[PDB]
Amino acid sequence: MEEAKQKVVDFLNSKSGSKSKFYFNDFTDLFPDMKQREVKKILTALVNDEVLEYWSSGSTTMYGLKGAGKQAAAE
Amino acid sequence: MEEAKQKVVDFLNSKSGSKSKFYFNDFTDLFPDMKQREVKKILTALVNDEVLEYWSSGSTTMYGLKGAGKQAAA
């Protein structure tokens, strides 16, 4: 995986201070050096590859690692 | 995603499914027409792609969707 994508996965794959999904703007907050359009492109490629799952949320979007939604529902 | 890989992801991406630990032979049980080595290569590709994570467990190996280990722990 390329470094920018690996940094998304590593943030999400954390025990402490984490949850099943984060806003688009949580990722731009974490990678302020990147263009926001490029953050959207890398997140979308990770959803297409099924590393991430995608959600609509209100007026924006959320992302988490594949399976996190069902795992949290299970509880 | 190729069909066998998608079958593994869909099997794991479920509520029932997230409550459980699945070992290598549980996946080979789902692919009776395949050699164990072919299933190991499918699962290893999914680990490389970081769709799955895996580790050694007991006498075998355990596979889950990426992040499952640390979600559950939290």
Is B72–A70 a contact, with Cβ atoms under 8 angstroms apart?
no
Residue spans per domain, chain B: 1-74
Nearest-Cα distance to chain A for B12, in Å, is 7
Q: By three-state DSSP, how is residue A2 classified? A: coil
Tell which residue, A43, A37, A4, has the closest CA to residue A21. Answer: A43
Nearest-Cα distance to chain A for B52, in Å, is 8
Distance of CA B43 to the CA centre of its chain: 6
Q: Six-digit token pair at A44?
A: 């979308």
Q: How would DSSP label each residue in B2-28?
A: -HHHHHHHHHHSSHHHHSS-EEHHHHH
Tell which residue, B23, B20, B42, has the closest CA to residue B33. Answer: B42
> What's the fold here for domain B1-74?
Arc Repressor Mutant, subunit A (1.10.10)
Integer Cα distance of B12 and B68 in angstroms: 10
Residue B71: how many CA atoms within 13 Å on its side-chain side? 24
Tell which residue, A28, A23, A61, A67, has the closest CA to residue B72. Answer: A67
Q: Which CATH architecture has domain A1-75?
A: Orthogonal Bundle (1.10)
Residue A68 near residue A51, CB atoms below 8 Å: no
Option in B1, B19, B71 nearest A68 (CB): B71
Contacts of B18 in chain A (CB under 8 A): 67, 70-71, 74
Structure determination method: X-ray
Residue B19: how many CA atoms within 13 Å on its side-chain side? 6
Contacts of B63 in chain A (CB under 8 A): none
Backbone angles phi and psi of A14, in degrees to 5 = -130, 145
Integer Cα distance of A9 and A11 in angstroms: 6
Nearest-Cα distance to chain A for B8, in Å, is 12
Q: Six-digit token pair at A35?
A: 């263009």
What amino acid is encoded at B16 in this protein?
A: S
Integer Cα distance of B40 and A35 in angstroms: 38
Q: How would DSSP label each residue in A4-65?
A: HHHHHHHHHS-STT--S-EEHHHHHHH-TTS-HHHHHHHHHHHHHTTSEEEEEETTEEEEEE
Integer Cα distance of B74 and B57 in angstroms: 20
Contacts of B53 in chain A (CB under 8 A): 13
Helix (H) or strand (E) holding B61, with range, is: strand B60-65
Q: How many CB atoms lie within 10 A of CB B37?
A: 9
